Amino acid sequence: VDCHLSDMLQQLHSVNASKPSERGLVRQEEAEDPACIPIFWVSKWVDYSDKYGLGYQLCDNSVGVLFNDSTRLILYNDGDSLQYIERDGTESYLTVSSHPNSLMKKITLLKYFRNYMSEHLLKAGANITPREGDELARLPYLRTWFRTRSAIILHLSNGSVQINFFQDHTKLILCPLMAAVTYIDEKRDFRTYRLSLLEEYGCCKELASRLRYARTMVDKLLSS
């Protein structure tokens, strides 16, 4: 799931080079694929980077924190099972009930972040139903993230890249393994498209613009 950014960059290059909003008749609806709907995405997030780090919630109700020291702590949706990731990327699986005294500080912080998100924030894509075996899938963690004047970029450990636009609340979820893109528009409508089909049928200026922006963002992730 490492070399996935370069695949995503190639997929984006391909779609953007085809100038999808410049077709004779763009038939975006023909590029839709319900089978390509992602299993995981960031439904909530909090920036506390000045002192602690970034807290986030995934759509399965699991919470995670990417601390300033570049370590990660993830609490599974059961509210007891924990995953701790060191800077090197080494994973450790523990529980709140039987936790090392070494993680007491970081667990307390995660619980504050979890409680903040629950009390204050709206769940993105709350209406989406999970598939028959999705619950057994490996729970991803937040590898890296950054902010711009226009959006927040979230890079997950499973290779997926999420871009949340600030002004209009639109969101992109790029999955390189499925070569697909999920777009959540201003009306909160959730649509998943195959990138090879957007090349074939085209898309609206709105989505085409976000995809050009996404290419710039993926380039930044690769250069970092």
């Binding site: 960031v42 909530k44 997030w45 909090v46 920036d47 506390y48 980077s49 000045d50 903040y116 204050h120 924030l121 709206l122 993105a124 902010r147 927040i152 949340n164 609340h169």
Partner: peptide
Amino acid sequence: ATPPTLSSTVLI
């Protein structure tokens, strides 16, 4: 309670 730097969409 100190408010965060930024956050996702707040509830209504």
